[PDB]
Design a protein around this ligand. Structure first.
Ligand SMILES: CCCCCCCCCCC(CCCCCCCCCC)(CO[C@H]1O[C@@H](CO)[C@H](O[C@@H]2O[C@@H](CO)[C@H](O)[C@@H](O)[C@@H]2O)[C@@H](O)[C@@H]1O)CO[C@H]1O[C@@H](CO)[C@H](O[C@@H]2O[C@@H](CO)[C@H](O)[C@@H](O)[C@@H]2O)[C@@H](O)[C@H]1O
Ligand SMILES: Cc1cc2cccnc2c(N2CCC[N@@H+](Cc3csc(N4CCC(O)CC4)n3)CC2)c1OCCCC(=O)O
Ligand SMILES: CC(C)CCC[C@@H](C)[C@H]1CC[C@H]2[C@@H]3CC=C4C[C@@H](O)CC[C@]4(C)[C@H]3CC[C@]12C
Ligand SMILES: CC(C)CCC[C@@H](C)[C@H]1CC[C@H]2[C@@H]3CC=C4C[C@@H](O)CC[C@]4(C)[C@H]3CC[C@]12C
Ligand SMILES: CC(C)CCC[C@@H](C)[C@H]1CC[C@H]2[C@@H]3CC=C4C[C@@H](O)CC[C@]4(C)[C@H]3CC[C@]12C
Ligand SMILES: CC(C)CCC[C@@H](C)[C@H]1CC[C@H]2[C@@H]3CC=C4C[C@@H](O)CC[C@]4(C)[C@H]3CC[C@]12C
Ligand SMILES: CC(C)CCC[C@@H](C)[C@H]1CC[C@H]2[C@@H]3CC=C4C[C@@H](O)CC[C@]4(C)[C@H]3CC[C@]12C
Ligand SMILES: CC(C)CCC[C@@H](C)[C@H]1CC[C@H]2[C@@H]3CC=C4C[C@@H](O)CC[C@]4(C)[C@H]3CC[C@]12C
Lengths: 62, 108, 306, 127, 125, 107
């Protein structure tokens, strides 16, 4: 049971993200991966966030 | 999993307190959902997870959770909010809807 | 001003061949490890009736390697089924506990033997046999206790879980949600510091010292070989170096220090599995190095068998 | 913007067979899981089954296992439910809904976001 | 291998003496050096032992506190210093080696004093 | 120290015969008993090391055994060179303790 994300990040705000990505995986289903421009790093976003889920749904819906 | 949903029906007026409950015979990690269906229309999702309101639902609806005991509260019922409310759990690969509660206008 | 890209990872194309070959080799490891460790224990117990001063570490090491080999059938059954766990939660917990305890015990006894071999020249040379026997017994108890202590925490959190969508059951560790990164990383450090770093450092340093001491003397260097000692050190490296390199790359992948893509998924799955198979030649090679090469052991085995 | 259309309902004599088709248009069909739900006449909703479009992770309810099957065609963006051996208690209205199985640590998202408009299935032997 | 003992010579009661055992053919640091004695017309009796590597020494109960055994590894030598000698200390003192063989470490035996020396006669008048 | 009683103190066995000597310990010594022989006025030479492992060089006549704490030495054929004193030793506990000896004399 190996999938790209093993844990979440629940302290990321909208102003601290510059590029999102949605991974579809055979094991862990839909996952998100954000690129924080404050330190240019890559994190795994928590879907529970109010803005993340709605933003991703409009990206997929379109 | 059996999801008992009390009461069988509610008699309430416009603006009065309206509460519905949903007991899970097993443990579901906040993985529930509350829907409403008009008599001749498809259900409309109202709450997911346990309390996260859907995108467009009004703010009156509010979900809660205590161990495994999920409550749906509709503060200040309006005339628009007279339908049948259903309780779902999706923690397990098999989903189960509740019996469904019907809220009816109270008169005399 | 945020671009929402999407990436769908296809299924694993050619993992079936890898799992087939890995199981085919695990069978040989199991057979050979079982036979070799049983013989070592038998002769170690039965050679005390001839007057030999048989060593405790080489008996405890044989037992620990035997226990680890005993759990290979369970791993193969889980591996063939695309890494799935038909058994229950109790079986997974018990198997993990036994495997972890005995594997850690095996490594610790190797380090202890490395130290004791040098002390037996320099220090335990005017010590009565009874005193050194007592010291070895105390060390054996401590090593077993330490192995058990290290293994317990990991097995505590192990729980079998059925995927909510795949409908497939796995057995993995479910650490507390509020702190998972602090757990995973933490555990890895232990497995790399008490597993490879400290044992390898002690082994390398003390075997170098032993070789120096043998070279200084004349009778010892006439009788003893300086290539078997270097064989000990290099064999430990070949078994346990690639496995930890692969695991560390996996951890760097988890922390998103390396960009993700399907190629890394395949090339890390392959690396982990291949190196896992290699690293278990530990049990097959321990008897062939510490017992089956010794002239005394070979003569004793020939006499006992006949 | 998102449309789910169900077609295939009607009458089915006892022991008959039927095929309901749910055609979707307006979202990434390969990133969503399609669920089929029932509603008996006068009773409440009962969940039937679903399918992961891009991987075929099918799952069935207890009352339909071994009689109902699902198959998703991503090229045409349509999910088909094949119903076999309809006992007189299978009469209902069948709804097609979709989900985005977002990964949560302890479970997966399963709240049916968009529902179709239902198709009636009658299982009776009469003129 | 060959051990040579130097010393001997009669001493006065309460005096002292210093015997030396020099070994050729092996590194004295890899074996323990034992001093044994045999009284006139009596059986062998242990006296002392030393490890020339780290200096772990053992003495018999009879002579503990009067004898001191000390080794020097540069010249492969082991010395026994006898102080407060008494009348019964008259004997013939041999120096022996308890060999240790590295190639038999895991499966070894209880090695004995294979190599001895001619030993010197110590008299205490 | 640990006492070690060796009997008998004199053998009158003649040439070509079988001779047996015994040494019983007080405590238990785990196969750490050795037998030495000494000619009149000469240094002793190891004969058996460990409970029974014959030394490398002594004839095959000499053979040791063990039974709990009751060790024994047997010389199968008392060839005339085998008339000397024999001592039993233990190294399991320091101080090392020897036996009383056993002089073997021609009949
Ligand atoms: C890269 C390191 C190289 C070190 C090689 C030395 C290995 C041998 C040490 C022998 C030792 C400890 C034995 C227990 C240690 C177990 C092994 C540790 C395993 C580590 C995982 C016995 O200690 C001896 O010390 C003697 C006095 O010197 C005394 O006689 C006794 O105390 C005893 O014999 C200490 O020896 C040494 O101690 C040091 C200062 O203590 C002295 O300076 C030395 O001169 C030497 O004595
Ligand atoms: C077949 C197999 C071989 C393995 C070889 C080496 C290590 N592991 C193996 C393994 N697993 C790996 C998982 C984590 N591992 C934790 C663990 C405990 S002790 C330990 N040592 C690592 C080296 C260090 O030097 C000392 C400590 N590592 C449990 C066992 C295996 O099983 C397959 C897993 C399938 C399933 O999970 O069903
Ligand atoms: C947690 C458990 C189930 C893991 C399995 C560990 C078992 C096999 C370990 C734990 C303690 C170990 C024992 C500890 C001490 C000794 C003394 C030694 O002179 C012989 C082996 C022996 C008797 C060990 C055998 C193996 C042993 C019993
Ligand atoms: C992390 C693990 C692998 C480290 C294990 C280190 C081992 C080799 C260390 C731990 C404690 C050490 C022992 C501590 C005390 C003594 C008493 C001394 O009179 C002889 C050496 C001896 C018996 C040591 C030998 C080496 C030893 C056993
Ligand atoms: C065998 C014994 C003596 C040593 C075993 C190593 C100990 C020190 C290791 C084993 C697992 C480790 C823990 C793993 C997880 C966590 C949670 C984190 O939020 C704080 C650190 C903490 C608590 C670690 C501290 C060190 C730890 C307890
Ligand atoms: C220390 C030595 C003896 C280790 C022997 C095992 C080596 C040869 C093993 C360890 C891990 C293996 C690699 C693991 C992953 C990949 C990625 C794959 O896309 C091509 C093969 C390749 C590159 C493997 C080749 C063989 C490999 C390098
Ligand atoms: C300690 C030393 C001597 C152990 C030697 C064992 C080596 C040769 C074993 C360990 C794991 C084995 C590998 C396991 C898996 C594969 C993948 C397969 O597609 C080609 C063979 C290959 C690459 C095997 C070749 C042999 C192999 C590398
Ligand atoms: C059974 C498998 C896993 C063992 C793998 C290690 C093998 C290759 C090791 C174990 C012992 C080693 C031998 C040990 C001693 C000697 C004597 C030396 O003068 C030449 C090399 C030689 C002959 C070594 C060759 C390599 C060797 C045979």
């Amino acid at each position: 049971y190996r999938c790209p994300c093993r844990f979440f990040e629940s302290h990321v705000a909208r102003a601290n993200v510059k590029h999102l990505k949605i991974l579809n995986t055979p094991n862990c289903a839909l996952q998100i991966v954000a690129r924080l421009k404050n330190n240019n790093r890559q994190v795994c976003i928590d879907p529970k966030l109010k803005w993340i889920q709605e933003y991703l749904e409009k990206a997929l819906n379109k | 999993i059996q999801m008992t949903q009390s009461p069988s029906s509610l008699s309430a007026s416009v603006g009065d307190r309206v509460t519905i409950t949903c007991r899970a015979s097993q443990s579901v990690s906040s993985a529930v959902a509350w829907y409403q269906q008009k008599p001749g229309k498809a259900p409309k999702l109202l709450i997911y997870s346990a309390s996260s309101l859907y995108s467009g639902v009004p703010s009156r609806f509010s979900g809660s959770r205590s161990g495994t005991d999920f409550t749906l509260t509709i503060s200040s019922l309006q005339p628009e909010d007279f339908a049948t409310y259903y309780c779902q759990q999706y923690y397990y690969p098999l989903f189960t809807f509740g019996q469904g509660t019907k809220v009816e206008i109270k008169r005399t | 001003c945020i671009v929402v890209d999407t990436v769908m990872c296809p299924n694993m194309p050619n993992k079936s061949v890898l799992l087939y070959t890995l199981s085919f080799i695990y069978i040989f490891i199991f057979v050979i490890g079982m036979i070799a460790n049983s013989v070592v224990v038998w002769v170690n117990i039965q050679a005390k009736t001839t007057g030999y001063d048989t060593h405790c570490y080489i008996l405890n090491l044989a037992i620990a390697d035997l226990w680890v080999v005993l759990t290979i059938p369970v791993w193969v059954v889980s591996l063939v089924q695309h890494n799935q766990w038909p058994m229950g939660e109790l079986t997974c917990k018990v198997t993990h506990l036994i495997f972890s305890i005995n594997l850690f015990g095996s490594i610790f006894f190797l380090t202890c033997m490395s130290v004791d071999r040098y002390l037996s020249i320099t220090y335990f040379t005017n010590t009565p046999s009874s005193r050194k026997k007592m010291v070895r017994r105390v060390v054996c108890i401590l090593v077993w206790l330490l192995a058990f202590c290290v293994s317990l925490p990991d097995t505590y959190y192990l729980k079998t879980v059925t995927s909510a969508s795949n409908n497939e059951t796995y057995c993995r560790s479910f650490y507390p949600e509020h702190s998972i990164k602090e757990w995973l990383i933490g555990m890895e450090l232990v497995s790399v510091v008490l597993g490879f770093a400290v044992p390898f450092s002690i082994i390398a340093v003390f075997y170098f010292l032993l070789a120096r001491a043998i070279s200084a003397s004349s009778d010892q260097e006439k009788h003893s070989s300086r290539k078997i000692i270097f064989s000990y050190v290099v064999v430990f490296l070949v078994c346990w170096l690639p496995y930890h390199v692969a695991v560390l790359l996996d951890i760097f992948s988890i922390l998103h220090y390396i960009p993700f893509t399907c190629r890394l998924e395949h090339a890390l799955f392959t690396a982990l599995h291949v190196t896992q198979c290699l690293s278990l030649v530990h049990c097959c090679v321990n008897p062939v190095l510490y017992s089956f090469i010794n002239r005394n052991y070979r003569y004793e085995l020939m006499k006992a068998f006949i | 913007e998102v449309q789910l259309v169900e077609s295939g309902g009607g009458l089915v004599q006892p022991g008959g067979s039927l095929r309901l088709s749910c055609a979707a248009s307006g979202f990434n069909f390969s990133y969503s899981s399609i669920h089929w739900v029932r509603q008996a006449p006068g009773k409440g909703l009962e969940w039937v089954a679903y399918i992961y479009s891009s991987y075929g992770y099918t799952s069935y309810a207890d009352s339909v296992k071994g009689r109902f099957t699902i198959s998703a065609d991503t090229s045409k963006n349509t999910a088909y439910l094949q119903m076999n051996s309809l006992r007189a208690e299978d009469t209902a209205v069948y709804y097609c809904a979709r989900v985005y199985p977002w990964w949560y640590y302890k479970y997966y998202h399963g709240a049916l976001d968009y529902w179709g408009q239902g198709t009636l299935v009658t299982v009776s032997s009469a003129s």
